[PDB]
């Protein structure tokens with residue numbers, strides 16, 4: 001039986017970022033633009049998409 | 050590597066349940082549960098720190 | 102027509118259940134139960150009045166009060182001593198006049214109980230409560246991520 | 258082959274190198290807060306068991 | 307009162323290849339209701355409840371086929387011919403192609 | 411028993427954290443009130459990625475919009491387990507390990 | 515439907531047919547041209563367009 | 564309990580049915596004969 005690791009998502013906010021491959025097994029990567037993170041403290045950054 | 054524990058802190062988590070039965074932030078987030086033990090015991094990994 | 106509640110009082114009822122597990126009289130008779138809500142909320146109509154002061158008191162609105170009747174007289178009680186159970190404690194959600202809105206997992210009966218410090222009175226009724234949910238797949242709880250769909254829920 | 262025995266394979270139990278694919282596809286966040294939604298097939302080992 | 311509520315997005319299936327057909331590797335962990343229908347004169351409505359995971363065949367209609375699964379929107383998949391019809395200048399069993407399509 | 415000799419859990423320093431109480435916008439001009447006796451960093455992009463450090467101080471920025479500038483109470487003292495509900499410091503490095511108790 | 519015309523230009527076009535023997539008459543501007551060829555069945559036999 | 568499947572999973576030709584007018588939409592069957600009238604000015608003389 002296996003266990004899927006879900007490391008904390010990287011956020012490059014009010015900027016641009018690109019995916020990078022790695023060596024870990026089953027590694028799957030994907031970027032998303034227009035996201036808008038929110039947290040208990042509030043908006044974690046400042047830019048419309 | 051080490052086993053000292055005073056060097057870490059508890060982290061707020063996002064739990065699907067809350068006292069009002071809707072997802073919300075909380076300090077007792079659970080993200081892992083193991084029950085393979087034949088005796089029936091269950092390990093729970095919570096966000097907070099206890100025992101110390 | 103109106104909505105004033107100080108003009109009405111509670112009424113003794115006959116419940117199939119009591120503390121001693123046989124039909125008997127009680128001031129907590131329930132004659133109606135609705136379950137159509139998609140969320141799972143349950144409306145319970147009891148014979149007592151809560152959410153208001155003792156019917157006819159100087160003050161009429163008080164959340165902590167619970168107006169009921171016995172011994173040829175009406176009187177109050179601390180509303181915190183009211184519990185609801187189907188297969189285990191339910192979480193009270195709202196109360197007004199005769200009616201209250203609660204929620205708890207499924208079972209086979211609905212029970213409403215009050216402890217009077219030294220004695221307890223509970224009344225219950227059979228009702229086929231079964232968990233239901235909307236969508237083309239029956240889940241356990243609505244997960245964090247997914248589509249948004251129209252449904253109907255009891256306003257709180 | 259996802260959903261079958263031998264979905265996770267390793268030369269040794271504690272081999273740092275692992276080779277395995279189990280059809281993990283990410284989903285675009287669609288919630289107010291921060292959350293990475295993942296979706297994968299059921300573990301093959303459990304199905305074989 | 308009517309209101310918006312959330313619902314899960316079931317794991318997306320995998321589409322395979324099958325001459326004048328499809329095979330779906332349906333994977334789910336909780337009961338899920340799948341439905342499908344042709345687009346021709348005959349509705350050929352089909353519905354099912356799936357508990358775990360399995361594989362299901364579907365005779366895709368020649369004109370087209372609908373596909374509904376989970377809570378997400380449906381898709382339309384159509385089919386065509388793939389038998390070896392045209393010859394290559396030498397004697398051939400061309401009839402087999404016309405046996406695969408319009409056998410009667 | 412508390413003692414264990416199986417498992418290996420990672421740990422690394424925390425990411426940044428945002429807050430609303432650090433900034434006030436009752437008037438048209440921005441206002442930042444970091445908690446008393448506590449360092450704070452503030453950042454906003456109007457014109458440029460202007461950033462500043464305040465030690466129990468209320469520094470100001472030219473741009474006025476409430477949403478514009480955000481504040482971190484950066485301490486980077488205690489490590490934290492990786493979880494989807496956190497954010498990663500730009501370094502993205504593993505700092506320590508811990509034992510999962512009560513093992514088979 | 516329409517294309518630019520030069521003194522001696524030649525232009526490629528895209529078309530679909532429901533028969534293997536693709537023989538027909540094509541009108542370019544006001545003139546006509548009869549012409550024919552042979553097509554083959556495709557490898558992919560299910561599509562949704 | 565036993566009402567059966569709705570019409571969204573039985574309508575032939577993939578009619579998408581909306582309740583409030585109670586109308587089907589976006590499904591195909593049959594042939595439409597249509598007569599179209601074009602203004603003369605839209606035409607271009609063969610000379611040019």
Ligand SMILES: *[C@@H]1O[C@H](CO)[C@@H](O)[C@H](O)[C@H]1NC(C)=O
Nearest residue numbers: 447448449450463464465466
């Ligand atoms: C903030 O950090 C600087 C950098 O060392 C230090 O000089 C200052 O005293 C700190 N302020 C507070 C309030 O701790």
